[PDB]
């Protein structure tokens, strides 16, 4: 019936979490992590891959680390919200220009480290696919095995989407984010 930020989409790449829904000209889009989307085209709302919802429009990875999925199923809703679980939703109003020290939370993290702060901006990391620059380091941590694409917010303001991989949150693991503002700007998308 609906796909929100924080929900998982399924494809030939496996599972990837929607960071944020956005819109342009009455069309709806999902902003996702770039490495996770990989070389997949078709995205489904269910693990059975019976409810097709959209297609990969663009991948900005490496360099950046996000992808844009265009929703094509007009029978499903794509609200400008994050799913907090339990039928509760967070309305995302706009995006932040990340600044060191600001608070940031990962709705859904069950690590005890769901909320934290921006520790550094403009961080680079080398992946097998290439260098990724422009990343945010946070003190929050979500389980790295399911982290890819999870939304990070400050109140109702979108900060970024989590990169997958890295260390366990119990062993000093650090969650890095792809900031959302550059993606909105690059693709003309608005958080509705």
PDB file of C-alpha atoms in Angstrom:
ATOM      1  CA  UNK A   1       0.000   0.000   0.000  1.00  0.00           C
ATOM      2  CA  UNK A   2       2.838   2.425   0.759  1.00  0.00           C
ATOM      3  CA  UNK A   3       6.628   2.598   0.813  1.00  0.00           C
ATOM      4  CA  UNK A   4       8.334   5.025   3.238  1.00  0.00           C
ATOM      5  CA  UNK A   5      11.859   5.907   4.233  1.00  0.00           C
ATOM      6  CA  UNK A   6      13.239   3.097   6.369  1.00  0.00           C
ATOM      7  CA  UNK A   7      11.333   0.416   4.475  1.00  0.00           C
ATOM      8  CA  UNK A   8      13.197  -2.193   2.427  1.00  0.00           C
ATOM      9  CA  UNK A   9      12.924  -2.741  -1.327  1.00  0.00           C
ATOM     10  CA  UNK A  10      13.963  -5.985  -3.012  1.00  0.00           C
ATOM     11  CA  UNK A  11      15.756  -6.657  -6.261  1.00  0.00           C
ATOM     12  CA  UNK A  12      18.429  -8.779  -7.929  1.00  0.00           C
ATOM     13  CA  UNK A  13      20.909  -6.879  -5.727  1.00  0.00           C
ATOM     14  CA  UNK A  14      19.210  -8.257  -2.619  1.00  0.00           C
ATOM     15  CA  UNK A  15      17.642  -5.933  -0.058  1.00  0.00           C
ATOM     16  CA  UNK A  16      18.211  -2.159   0.038  1.00  0.00           C
ATOM     17  CA  UNK A  17      16.617   0.331   2.434  1.00  0.00           C
ATOM     18  CA  UNK A  18      14.914   3.483   1.194  1.00  0.00           C
ATOM     19  CA  UNK A  19      16.528   6.508   2.766  1.00  0.00           C
ATOM     20  CA  UNK A  20      13.989   9.134   1.757  1.00  0.00           C
ATOM     21  CA  UNK A  21      11.136   9.541  -0.668  1.00  0.00           C
ATOM     22  CA  UNK A  22      11.126  12.712  -2.754  1.00  0.00           C
ATOM     23  CA  UNK A  23       9.220  14.226  -5.644  1.00  0.00           C
ATOM     24  CA  UNK A  24       9.627  16.212  -8.843  1.00  0.00           C
ATOM     25  CA  UNK A  25       6.739  17.249 -11.086  1.00  0.00           C
ATOM     26  CA  UNK A  26       4.227  14.836  -9.624  1.00  0.00           C
ATOM     27  CA  UNK A  27       6.592  11.843  -9.995  1.00  0.00           C
ATOM     28  CA  UNK A  28       7.919  10.107  -6.887  1.00  0.00           C
ATOM     29  CA  UNK A  29      11.435   8.833  -6.201  1.00  0.00           C
ATOM     30  CA  UNK A  30      13.409   6.930  -3.586  1.00  0.00           C
ATOM     31  CA  UNK A  31      16.935   7.971  -2.604  1.00  0.00           C
ATOM     32  CA  UNK A  32      18.938   4.855  -1.712  1.00  0.00           C
ATOM     33  CA  UNK A  33      22.549   3.892  -1.051  1.00  0.00           C
ATOM     34  CA  UNK A  34      24.552   3.571  -4.257  1.00  0.00           C
ATOM     35  CA  UNK A  35      26.689   0.530  -3.512  1.00  0.00           C
ATOM     36  CA  UNK A  36      23.637  -1.503  -2.488  1.00  0.00           C
ATOM     37  CA  UNK A  37      21.657  -0.709  -5.631  1.00  0.00           C
ATOM     38  CA  UNK A  38      24.533  -1.879  -7.738  1.00  0.00           C
ATOM     39  CA  UNK A  39      23.466  -3.091 -11.147  1.00  0.00           C
ATOM     40  CA  UNK A  40      19.780  -3.696 -10.415  1.00  0.00           C
ATOM     41  CA  UNK A  41      16.936  -2.244 -12.471  1.00  0.00           C
ATOM     42  CA  UNK A  42      13.643  -3.487 -10.993  1.00  0.00           C
ATOM     43  CA  UNK A  43      12.536  -2.928  -7.411  1.00  0.00           C
ATOM     44  CA  UNK A  44       9.790  -4.730  -5.493  1.00  0.00           C
ATOM     45  CA  UNK A  45       8.049  -3.935  -2.223  1.00  0.00           C
ATOM     46  CA  UNK A  46       8.006  -7.583  -1.083  1.00  0.00           C
ATOM     47  CA  UNK A  47      10.579 -10.323  -0.615  1.00  0.00           C
ATOM     48  CA  UNK A  48       8.506 -12.515  -2.937  1.00  0.00           C
ATOM     49  CA  UNK A  49       9.123  -9.939  -5.700  1.00  0.00           C
ATOM     50  CA  UNK A  50       5.445  -9.830  -6.665  1.00  0.00           C
ATOM     51  CA  UNK A  51       4.738  -6.100  -6.140  1.00  0.00           C
ATOM     52  CA  UNK A  52       6.917  -4.130  -8.565  1.00  0.00           C
ATOM     53  CA  UNK A  53       7.219  -0.497  -7.517  1.00  0.00           C
ATOM     54  CA  UNK A  54       9.981   1.203  -9.510  1.00  0.00           C
ATOM     55  CA  UNK A  55      13.183   1.237 -11.534  1.00  0.00           C
ATOM     56  CA  UNK A  56      16.684   2.534 -11.011  1.00  0.00           C
ATOM     57  CA  UNK A  57      16.972   5.945 -12.584  1.00  0.00           C
ATOM     58  CA  UNK A  58      20.595   6.773 -11.751  1.00  0.00           C
ATOM     59  CA  UNK A  59      23.516   5.522  -9.663  1.00  0.00           C
ATOM     60  CA  UNK A  60      25.998   8.045  -8.250  1.00  0.00           C
ATOM     61  CA  UNK A  61      28.625   5.660  -6.903  1.00  0.00           C
ATOM     62  CA  UNK A  62      31.613   5.859  -6.401  1.00  0.00           C
ATOM     63  CA  UNK A  63      32.475   9.488  -5.895  1.00  0.00           C
ATOM     64  CA  UNK A  64      29.168   9.903  -4.158  1.00  0.00           C
ATOM     65  CA  UNK A  65      27.308   6.928  -2.693  1.00  0.00           C
ATOM     66  CA  UNK A  66      23.612   7.208  -3.550  1.00  0.00           C
ATOM     67  CA  UNK A  67      21.150   6.070  -6.163  1.00  0.00           C
ATOM     68  CA  UNK A  68      17.807   7.395  -7.320  1.00  0.00           C
ATOM     69  CA  UNK A  69      14.910   5.008  -7.956  1.00  0.00           C
ATOM     70  CA  UNK A  70      11.893   6.295  -9.880  1.00  0.00           C
ATOM     71  CA  UNK A  71       8.622   4.863  -8.628  1.00  0.00           C
ATOM     72  CA  UNK A  72       6.409   3.605 -11.435  1.00  0.00           C
ATOM     73  CA  UNK A  73       3.521   1.824  -9.610  1.00  0.00           C
ATOM     74  CA  UNK A  74       0.690   4.321  -9.302  1.00  0.00           C
ATOM     75  CA  UNK A  75      -1.346   2.057  -7.010  1.00  0.00           C
ATOM     76  CA  UNK A  76       1.184   2.420  -4.150  1.00  0.00           C
ATOM     77  CA  UNK A  77       1.723   5.582  -2.072  1.00  0.00           C
ATOM     78  CA  UNK A  78       5.145   7.156  -1.508  1.00  0.00           C
ATOM     79  CA  UNK A  79       4.690   9.662   1.303  1.00  0.00           C
ATOM     80  CA  UNK A  80       7.419  12.044   2.412  1.00  0.00           C
ATOM     81  CA  UNK A  81       7.818  10.164   5.663  1.00  0.00           C
ATOM     82  CA  UNK A  82       9.934   7.659   7.531  1.00  0.00           C
ATOM     83  CA  UNK A  83       8.390   4.508   9.001  1.00  0.00           C
ATOM     84  CA  UNK A  84       9.167   4.456  12.719  1.00  0.00           C
ATOM     85  CA  UNK A  85       7.438   1.106  13.218  1.00  0.00           C
ATOM     86  CA  UNK A  86       4.183   0.358  14.967  1.00  0.00           C
ATOM     87  CA  UNK A  87       2.182   2.476  12.562  1.00  0.00           C
ATOM     88  CA  UNK A  88       4.013   5.655  13.545  1.00  0.00           C
ATOM     89  CA  UNK A  89       5.499   7.915  10.873  1.00  0.00           C
ATOM     90  CA  UNK A  90       7.894  10.878  10.865  1.00  0.00           C
ATOM     91  CA  UNK A  91       7.195  13.673   8.362  1.00  0.00           C
ATOM     92  CA  UNK A  92      10.458  14.762   6.711  1.00  0.00           C
ATOM     93  CA  UNK A  93      10.265  18.508   5.991  1.00  0.00           C
ATOM     94  CA  UNK A  94      13.602  19.349   4.358  1.00  0.00           C
ATOM     95  CA  UNK A  95      17.309  18.617   4.425  1.00  0.00           C
ATOM     96  CA  UNK A  96      20.207  19.843   6.538  1.00  0.00           C
ATOM     97  CA  UNK A  97      23.597  21.075   5.447  1.00  0.00           C
ATOM     98  CA  UNK A  98      25.572  18.878   7.879  1.00  0.00           C
ATOM     99  CA  UNK A  99      27.678  20.610  10.538  1.00  0.00           C
ATOM    100  CA  UNK A 100      29.985  19.063  13.111  1.00  0.00           C
ATOM    101  CA  UNK A 101      28.340  18.732  16.515  1.00  0.00           C
ATOM    102  CA  UNK A 102      24.741  18.605  15.404  1.00  0.00           C
ATOM    103  CA  UNK A 103      22.496  15.870  16.706  1.00  0.00           C
ATOM    104  CA  UNK A 104      21.495  13.040  14.404  1.00  0.00           C
ATOM    105  CA  UNK A 105      19.401   9.926  14.901  1.00  0.00           C
ATOM    106  CA  UNK A 106      18.847   6.690  12.979  1.00  0.00           C
ATOM    107  CA  UNK A 107      15.173   5.793  13.501  1.00  0.00           C
ATOM    108  CA  UNK A 108      14.881   2.050  14.022  1.00  0.00           C
ATOM    109  CA  UNK A 109      18.373   1.305  15.312  1.00  0.00           C
ATOM    110  CA  UNK A 110      18.123  -1.063  18.268  1.00  0.00           C
ATOM    111  CA  UNK A 111      21.780  -0.798  19.306  1.00  0.00           C
ATOM    112  CA  UNK A 112      21.365   1.776  22.072  1.00  0.00           C
ATOM    113  CA  UNK A 113      23.320   4.085  19.757  1.00  0.00           C
ATOM    114  CA  UNK A 114      20.393   5.236  17.607  1.00  0.00           C
ATOM    115  CA  UNK A 115      21.067   8.892  18.427  1.00  0.00           C
ATOM    116  CA  UNK A 116      24.391  10.675  18.285  1.00  0.00           C
ATOM    117  CA  UNK A 117      26.156  13.610  16.725  1.00  0.00           C
ATOM    118  CA  UNK A 118      27.931  14.551  13.527  1.00  0.00           C
ATOM    119  CA  UNK A 119      31.600  13.965  14.367  1.00  0.00           C
ATOM    120  CA  UNK A 120      33.150  14.944  11.012  1.00  0.00           C
ATOM    121  CA  UNK A 121      32.121  16.155   7.550  1.00  0.00           C
ATOM    122  CA  UNK A 122      33.712  15.762   4.117  1.00  0.00           C
ATOM    123  CA  UNK A 123      35.153  12.312   4.922  1.00  0.00           C
ATOM    124  CA  UNK A 124      36.572  10.089   2.197  1.00  0.00           C
ATOM    125  CA  UNK A 125      36.803   6.310   2.136  1.00  0.00           C
ATOM    126  CA  UNK A 126      38.253   3.994  -0.508  1.00  0.00           C
ATOM    127  CA  UNK A 127      35.942   1.173  -1.560  1.00  0.00           C
ATOM    128  CA  UNK A 128      36.778  -1.568  -4.060  1.00  0.00           C
ATOM    129  CA  UNK A 129      34.743   0.333  -6.610  1.00  0.00           C
ATOM    130  CA  UNK A 130      36.600   3.606  -5.976  1.00  0.00           C
ATOM    131  CA  UNK A 131      36.920   6.549  -3.637  1.00  0.00           C
ATOM    132  CA  UNK A 132      33.766   7.914  -2.007  1.00  0.00           C
ATOM    133  CA  UNK A 133      34.104  11.492  -0.772  1.00  0.00           C
ATOM    134  CA  UNK A 134      31.818  13.967   0.999  1.00  0.00           C
ATOM    135  CA  UNK A 135      30.682  11.612   3.740  1.00  0.00           C
ATOM    136  CA  UNK A 136      29.488  12.395   7.255  1.00  0.00           C
ATOM    137  CA  UNK A 137      30.907  10.524  10.236  1.00  0.00           C
ATOM    138  CA  UNK A 138      28.456  10.118  13.116  1.00  0.00           C
ATOM    139  CA  UNK A 139      28.660   8.724  16.611  1.00  0.00           C
ATOM    140  CA  UNK A 140      25.343   6.939  16.050  1.00  0.00           C
ATOM    141  CA  UNK A 141      25.510   3.318  14.985  1.00  0.00           C
ATOM    142  CA  UNK A 142      23.110   0.916  13.344  1.00  0.00           C
ATOM    143  CA  UNK A 143      23.829  -2.770  12.722  1.00  0.00           C
ATOM    144  CA  UNK A 144      26.193  -2.719   9.710  1.00  0.00           C
ATOM    145  CA  UNK A 145      24.644  -5.783   8.051  1.00  0.00           C
ATOM    146  CA  UNK A 146      21.323  -4.015   7.418  1.00  0.00           C
ATOM    147  CA  UNK A 147      22.574  -0.430   7.527  1.00  0.00           C
ATOM    148  CA  UNK A 148      22.713   0.405   3.816  1.00  0.00           C
ATOM    149  CA  UNK A 149      20.344   3.206   3.113  1.00  0.00           C
ATOM    150  CA  UNK A 150      18.854   3.676   6.570  1.00  0.00           C
ATOM    151  CA  UNK A 151      17.740   7.282   7.066  1.00  0.00           C
ATOM    152  CA  UNK A 152      19.433   9.676   9.442  1.00  0.00           C
ATOM    153  CA  UNK A 153      17.497  12.723  10.625  1.00  0.00           C
ATOM    154  CA  UNK A 154      17.742  15.670  13.027  1.00  0.00           C
ATOM    155  CA  UNK A 155      14.162  16.195  14.155  1.00  0.00           C
ATOM    156  CA  UNK A 156      12.100  16.409  10.946  1.00  0.00           C
ATOM    157  CA  UNK A 157      15.204  17.326   8.897  1.00  0.00           C
ATOM    158  CA  UNK A 158      16.937  14.813   6.664  1.00  0.00           C
ATOM    159  CA  UNK A 159      20.683  14.501   7.167  1.00  0.00           C
ATOM    160  CA  UNK A 160      21.736  11.495   5.136  1.00  0.00           C
ATOM    161  CA  UNK A 161      21.565   7.762   4.511  1.00  0.00           C
ATOM    162  CA  UNK A 162      23.781   5.167   6.135  1.00  0.00           C
ATOM    163  CA  UNK A 163      26.532   3.254   4.394  1.00  0.00           C
ATOM    164  CA  UNK A 164      26.583  -0.478   4.911  1.00  0.00           C
ATOM    165  CA  UNK A 165      29.464  -2.517   6.246  1.00  0.00           C
ATOM    166  CA  UNK A 166      32.046  -1.781   8.900  1.00  0.00           C
ATOM    167  CA  UNK A 167      32.410  -2.826  12.497  1.00  0.00           C
ATOM    168  CA  UNK A 168      29.768  -4.037  14.922  1.00  0.00           C
ATOM    169  CA  UNK A 169      28.227  -1.278  17.009  1.00  0.00           C
ATOM    170  CA  UNK A 170      29.439  -3.071  20.157  1.00  0.00           C
ATOM    171  CA  UNK A 171      33.094  -2.996  19.031  1.00  0.00           C
ATOM    172  CA  UNK A 172      33.486   0.723  18.360  1.00  0.00           C
ATOM    173  CA  UNK A 173      31.803   0.648  14.954  1.00  0.00           C
ATOM    174  CA  UNK A 174      31.132   3.997  13.269  1.00  0.00           C
ATOM    175  CA  UNK A 175      28.210   4.770  10.936  1.00  0.00           C
ATOM    176  CA  UNK A 176      29.008   6.997   7.956  1.00  0.00           C
ATOM    177  CA  UNK A 177      26.312   8.789   5.973  1.00  0.00           C
ATOM    178  CA  UNK A 178      25.895   9.963   2.433  1.00  0.00           C
ATOM    179  CA  UNK A 179      24.366  13.450   2.871  1.00  0.00           C
ATOM    180  CA  UNK A 180      20.981  13.813   1.221  1.00  0.00           C
ATOM    181  CA  UNK A 181      21.197  17.505   0.257  1.00  0.00           C
ATOM    182  CA  UNK A 182      23.650  16.932  -2.640  1.00  0.00           C
ATOM    183  CA  UNK A 183      21.341  14.292  -4.112  1.00  0.00           C
ATOM    184  CA  UNK A 184      18.284  16.517  -3.888  1.00  0.00           C
ATOM    185  CA  UNK A 185      20.235  19.290  -5.594  1.00  0.00           C
ATOM    186  CA  UNK A 186      21.692  17.071  -8.314  1.00  0.00           C
ATOM    187  CA  UNK A 187      18.294  15.596  -9.296  1.00  0.00           C
ATOM    188  CA  UNK A 188      15.936  18.500  -8.619  1.00  0.00           C
ATOM    189  CA  UNK A 189      14.054  16.569  -5.942  1.00  0.00           C
ATOM    190  CA  UNK A 190      12.005  17.968  -3.058  1.00  0.00           C
ATOM    191  CA  UNK A 191      11.250  16.254   0.236  1.00  0.00           C
ATOM    192  CA  UNK A 192       7.453  16.410   0.250  1.00  0.00           C
TER     193      UNK A 192
END
